[PDB]
């Protein structure tokens, strides 16, 4: 059958095999490990005529050793035997035979991990490297015994390095052992002492071998670099292991590695090692070696020569790795530079040149992302330096601290401002298109924006903000009319200045500041240049995808800065007019146009959203200043609401919200002048709704149009609410002679009287939102849409029978809860019985009792009545007949929200503090009657339930025991035995507690009562 | 505590070094301009090709003193519309619940990717918001329209 085994092994690796690959694989997994699998593996490795894949399968079959103590020794002997076999066949001249070499190395590494774990005998290995060393010297089977645990010195170890493959095999063996010890330590932490064994024997041999490869020129092999990183990783996981001389000699090799000497290959690998150290465990390197790294990177200098070698050859990935390593190295040094700079606790001219070179490196020619990442990683460094300077003590500053800090950070501003220039993104989209480099450029801009937000606490307004304002306010960007810049250089400069100025001005308050009025009035072209950016970008024809995306970016930045300036517009109204006119000119250009080719419309919608967003912010803050523009806008809206427009329903809604924001502040001329606008908007919305419902029989388009106009009514109702920041309006809106509520209610009735709309959940939702807009508002607020009790009641009674009871009832019920909380003073238990009978009880037994949403809806309604006015629920005719029996049977319910609803119901019923003295006596009397069945339902649910619902009737039992401790024992001695004798134990232990630590007694009772 | 601040510093370094495109995160500033390491501001971009596309939804992350023994609390703005967002804004997510899949080793990157995945793939087992879950389950068209308008609402 050995011929059959070799047959299907070669069949598995054939290009197009027969029968099946999965089946011959399962059969190969079936031959092993069984008592002949081990002997098969030894015959597969000892036979030289087999293929390399078959021998690999032999070592893999050996790997299954998890199947007790004796077969491990019998395996390890043959592991080391076939080991020494192929490892002697390698060093002379074999080649490409090291695959099985690595697999056998992995098998021995697994053996070293398994044997040294906690669990005639067999002692510990302690040092497999030495054992491998003496195994290359060929009474025969007796040799492995004495060679294993004790071996030679360092001179013979260097003599082993007579060949290159010897050093390569030793580096790989130590590397695989270390990476496997790393994988085994990361998987599960039961090691704790094997690390000590590696520290006492393997660590010494590995350190001596690595240092021999680093110091000696002939013994040097690049594989040691990949081995060093492995050792460093394992050390980073445990903790004293020195590694100081290894880092020192790696620095010496990197400095000796030049273009002519090494071709910067060793320098690249050693820099990858240092980048790994600094990025993962930077504390692993001592202070002296980090000082040498500082003197090598910052200095003609060797570092400048390596950077020029990487730049001239167009190696952007290797330059990226270099920037990552240098930044991770510089981020750990902050307090020493900050102290020798800004705190006083020959060095000055040295640290001035130090910062000068660091700023020259911060600038760094070659545009970003596309080529370099130095500025991208340096942003986090400058953030740490800004926070470190801000975190410095007030009494510790240097005499020249503020001047040197201002100078350094202003040079930073002058360096990073051309870096984030939009010309870079233009060249990125030109060369690389829509790649991930654009996304990295957006993350770079967000990082520099946060850098400026942290730098403002140092530079102030005049050194950071006034530099941008005077840069863009004292010179016209467009001398010709229509504000066309015509110039690319100043356009990129002004887009950069608008972006930085916006992110700085968002953190301010333009109302409390008179400084903003002083700085803008000293700049004639400031507002003109901001509008020049908006109009230049908006009127830009999108030819390529690059010009389209840049157009969207310019519009985004402009609309955001305009949105940030509303406080200054309240402080300086006469500069507001050019903005409103320029905005509405662009706003009409992106509204009345229907040209779509083809995905351009998503850019039109993004522009239209940012414009209407800026309009919403301005109407939110500058309500008083915008009074004269109202009469033109309502007419333009009348032209937009036409069943043919380019606006989205969202833009229609936010437009109605903006007009309502301006209308809310028109309380000056009295309620009549403001009501002229309110009645005009009411007649326009209801007229267009009634026009659409009764003319073009409602289709999906008419449904979206009706939903849009209903949302417009909702935004208008929200916008007319007085912000939290006389009697004539109260009497007017209490009477509302213009019949605003009458027209709105009849319009909602006309929409909900249609069968295509009343059974839709969305229209019921927005209807109950609009009708319940005036509910729960602070009393005294002259709200226009404040509805009385009877109007909302007859409204719900009007549209509740003809609607869909499954999906549409909770909105009417939430509206009734709002009405109950509003009219809590004037409510009567008979009116509450009327609402309970008409809206819930008739529809209960058919549509509610078997529906979880409607069930939890009804329970939450009763809980709302108990929270607001308990006298309505207690004095109900269905209180003792319906509410109590039903909620009693619903205690061991299967729905989580239903369980929580019933538990909150009985909990509020017990712990309610709003009870009258008569109501409290009647409640205690009724509870002292049903309490029995209550404990039965509690233990019934607790028995049939499982974890995560145990704490539900715990708070119910906590309230029942605290409120009724005496009857608690009488009800427990009756309910416990039904749901054996050990149950009595909870009685003494629970009532003794009172409350606050039950459950702990309860699960200790459930544990008893479950096994039985 | 003191493990808490050391861990949050390491998290800040790790995030700032490597994170998904379109996210941002930064400690809020205290009155003295120093960072409140236990309260962060972040932004979650909607996934392209979903009704969430185009929005960047802002969240706050509040780390308890017992972090990382206890998970942070993550909140959207009050009134955010989603079936797994409480009225308060509290997100229902297994990795954010100490009683479920929270592990001390979970990083901010994993949290924010979890939130992104939750955005277009709500979990029915955590219905934190009645109207969102109801619309999702009974009027998908309304839910999608609301999501699209909220994406416009929080436009990038």
Residue numbers in the entry:
A (entry chain A): 3 to 69, 78 to 129, 137 to 155, 162 to 262, 269 to 328, 343 to 388, 396 to 775, 786 to 1039, ...
B (entry chain B): 2 to 157
Give passages from the manuscript.
S. cerevisiae Pdr6/Kap122 was originally identified as a pleiotropic drug–resistance protein and subsequently as an importin β superfamily member. Furthermore, we found that Pdr6 imports Ubc9, exports eIF5A, and thus, combines functions of Imp13 and Xpo4. Pdr6 is an all α-helical protein built of 19 canonical HEAT repeats followed by three helices (termed HEAT 20) at its very C-terminal region. The transport signals recognized by Pdr6 are folded domains.
Diffracting Ubc9-bound Pdr6 crystals were obtained from a complex comprising full-length S. cerevisiae Ubc9 and Pdr6 proteins. Pdr6 binds Ubc9 in an open superhelix conformation. In the import complex, Pdr6 adopts an open conformation where the distance between the tip of HEAT 20 and the loop between HEATs 4 and 5 is ∼25 Å. Ubc9 is bound to the inner surface of the superhelix with HEATs 6–18 of Pdr6 engaging in extensive interactions with Ubc9. The first interaction interface is formed by residues of HEATs 6–9 and involves mostly salt bridges. Several aspartic acid residues of Pdr6 at this region (D370, D429, D433, D436, D492, and D499) form a negatively charged patch, shielding the conserved basic residues at the helix α1, as well as the following loop and two β-strands of Ubc9. The second set of interactions involves HEATs 11–18 of Pdr6. Helices α4 and α3 of Ubc9 pack against HEATs 12–15 and HEATs 16–17, respectively. Overall, Pdr6 buries 1,473 Å2 of the Ubc9 surface area. Our structure of the Ubc9•Pdr6 import complex revealed that Pdr6 is transporting Ubc9 in an inhibited state with blocked interaction sites for the E1 SUMO-activating enzyme with SUMO E3 ligases and SUMOylation substrates.
